[PDB]
Amino acid sequence: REDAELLVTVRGGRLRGIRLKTPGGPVSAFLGIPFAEPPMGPRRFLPPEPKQPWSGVVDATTFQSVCYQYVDTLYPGFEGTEMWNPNRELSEDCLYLNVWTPYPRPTSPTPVLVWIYGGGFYSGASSLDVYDGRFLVQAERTVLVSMNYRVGAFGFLALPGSREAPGNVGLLDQRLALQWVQENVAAFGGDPTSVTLFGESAGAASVGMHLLSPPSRGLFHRAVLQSGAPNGPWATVGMGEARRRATQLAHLVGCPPGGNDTELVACLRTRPAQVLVNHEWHVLPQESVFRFSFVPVVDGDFLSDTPEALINAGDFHGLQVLVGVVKDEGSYFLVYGAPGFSKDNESLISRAEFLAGVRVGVPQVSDLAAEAVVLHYTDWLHPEDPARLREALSDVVGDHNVVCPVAQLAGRLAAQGARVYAYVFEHRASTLSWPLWMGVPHGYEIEFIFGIPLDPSRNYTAEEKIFAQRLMRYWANFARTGDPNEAPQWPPYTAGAQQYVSLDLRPLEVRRGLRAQACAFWNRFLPKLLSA
């Protein structure tokens, strides 16, 4: 006595899933499918090995463990923090993926959406409530896949050139999952010839890196980059600085008691996973509000050059991408260490706090460059207005880290053969627990893309549910056709007209300029100065 709809055979063996209820009807979920051998013991820091075939039926009936990661404790018990923290036990045995499909299974091959979570390459999990695929699959009849990938030291510690810790294995985790989709998604009714990757923040940077890595590029057809880009200043690190960071962590945990790499990694392997996590914060070169200790390394392998170079020199004919940002990208990060900031106050900073915030929000630039930032962002008719300083600091951090990297990628892709669509998400959710001064913070479009307002246990307003259904429709139209349009039209983004649309409760408004003036500073001038 079984349900045939919940039984699927993949190349590795048989799976049994669970049937979820949604407001619109049932969907089939296969949660926690193993796609790699567990990377534990001698397998830690190594590239993932494909999951060996199994006999019997594996129950894919619940989310599996979260990969080991630092857990944020800035506002304990605060919904705005807790929603991003692991909702499963931490474990190095965490390489599992999730498939949601219509109930019953599609008769015709169905387009596939593949989600890559964010969290600065040091955190995140596919099991977070806000990444629940059931509403998207029910509303738009797609197949949705999400995977866990190793973060922090376990996914991106790199001793470049070494066999034992080559770096970027968290990206290879993603790639292995993408390879699993090509080989297996048709068993769930998905179309391996229509796969759209989507991600946010570090997930968006991951998506972009798969675009720029030929072995990944054959595994999908379309890409969505939400509030992140591979050319972001926090998303990559050079070979030498990666080695310095790996060596510093090893030194901090007593390894060895630099030297031979094989030996150093062997010492690192004897350390408890939690010990590495608790020391990862002490590795960074400068105090920062952003920077993350272990991120993808540009070592000539996964990425043959810097993403910026690969973007600038790329031929992108035959590609559709959808990119965008939230209205207030910088605000969320400032409450995480910038002087004068708190979610519990107005964070009306002084001029001196503004100056100190630029250094933390724009880490590792010269004084000369920091002076250029201050000049650019200061209103010299109101140089000391606290409210204006707070707003300017938010734009500094958001422009440098999210908006301008996105705009640069969008412009280069459009000019080099791809069709681009761009948005700014401008709705502040009625459920938002953050203060009003933060506006629409980083990450808070995700719940609308995934249709979370349709959850009966939540309290979104009726118009926000309509709004959520409109965005799910845009995303699914893009996955099926490469075009979010079906009514107000969404024009493509081009390097000249630079048109984008605003996403909020009102109909689409077409505007031009993704912070065009600001991003000319970050993308055209400051790069000149650096090499001088």
Ligand X SMILES: *[C@@H]1O[C@H](CO[C@@H]2O[C@@H](C)[C@@H](O)[C@@H](O)[C@@H]2O)[C@@H](O[C@@H]2O[C@H](CO)[C@@H](O)[C@H](O)[C@H]2NC(C)=O)[C@H](O)[C@H]1NC(C)=O
Ligand Y SMILES: *[C@@H]1O[C@H](CO)[C@@H](O)[C@H](O)[C@H]1NC(C)=O
Three-state DSSP class for residue 212: coil
Interacting residue with ligand Y among 14, 163, 458, 524 (CB under 6 A): 458
Residue 163 or 458: the one with the smaller Cβ distance to ligand Y is 458
Interacting residue with ligand X among 62, 262, 430, 459 (CB under 6 A): 262
Alpha-carbon span 31 to 22, nearest angstrom: 16
Q: Pick the piece of the chain touching ligand Y (CB under 6 A) from 104-112, 246-254, 349-357, 457-465.
A: 457-465
By the rule CB under 8 A, 512 interacts with a copy of itself: yes
By the rule CB under 8 A, 530 interacts with a copy of itself: no
Alpha-carbon span 143 to 109, nearest angstrom: 10
The residue with tokens 């969008």 is 410
Q: Which of 484, 512, 503, 506 is nearest to 410 (CA)?
A: 512
Subset of 480-509 contacting a copy of itself (CB under 8 A): 498
251 is in an annotated binding site: no
Partner that binds at residue 107, options ligand Y, ligand X, a copy of itself, none, CB closer than 5 to 8 Å by kind: none
The DSSP string of 388-450 is HHHHHHHHHHHIIIIIHHHHHHHHHHHHTT-EEEEEEE----TT--S-GGG-SBTTTTHHHHT
Interacting residue with ligand Y among 87, 345, 459, 461 (CB under 6 A): 459
Residue 361 or 411: the one with the smaller Cβ distance to ligand X is 361
Question: What residues contact residue 74 under an 8 Å CB cut-off, 6+ apart?
Answer: 81, 335, 336
Find the radius of gyration of the CA atoms of the chain. 22
Residue 1 or 528: the one with the smaller Cβ distance to a copy of itself is 528
Strands 90-91 and 27-34: unpaired
By the rule CB under 6 A, 270 interacts with ligand X: no
Interacting residue with a copy of itself among 187, 252, 356, 372 (CB under 8 A): 372
Residue 292 or 341: the one with the smaller Cβ distance to ligand X is 341
What residues pair up with 145 in beta bridges, in sequence order? 99, 114
Strands 96-102 and 110-116: unpaired
Subset of 344-363 contacting a copy of itself (CB under 8 A): none
By the rule CB under 6 A, 350 interacts with ligand X: no
Both tokens of residue 400?
């440098």
Active site members: 201, 329, 442
Interacting residue ranges for a copy of itself, rule: CB under 8 A: 368, 371-372, 375, 378-381, 498, 512-513, 516-517, 519-521, 524-525, 528-529, 532
> Which residues define the annotated binding site?
84, 120, 131, 200-201, 332, 434, 442
- Residues in the site for ligand X, rule: CB under 6 A? 260, 262-263, 339-342, 344-348
